[PDB]
């Protein structure tokens, strides 16, 4: 069987604190 | 065999990987902490992050 993921499955990426941005 | 030529004697290897990282340590050279100042310039160290 199967299903939609949806937007599941994102983690951080480092161990570095950011705030108020969009980071590639 | 002791006969060997240099090339092919025994030579022990070690490794070093260090875990440089922007998380907390827990190896650190033998270094001295200070006290702490707030509110006024000063020059830092953290962890070797200076
Ligand atoms: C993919 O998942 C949907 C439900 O999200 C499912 O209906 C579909 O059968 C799945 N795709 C295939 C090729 O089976």
Do not use: I, M, W
């Not at chain 2, 060997?4 to 907390?24: D, I, T």
């Not at chain 2, 827990?26 to 160290?45: E, M, R, Y």
């Amino acid at each position: 069987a199967y299903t939609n993921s949806f937007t599941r499955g994102v983690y951080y990426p480092d161990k570095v604190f950011r705030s108020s941005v969009l980071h590639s | 065999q002791p006969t060997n030529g240099v090339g092919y004697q025994p030579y022990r290897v070690v490794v070093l990987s260090f875990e440089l990282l922007h998380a907390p340590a827990t190896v650190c050279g033998p270094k001295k902490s200070t006290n702490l100042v707030k509110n006024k310039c000063v020059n830092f160290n953290f962890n070797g992050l200076t």
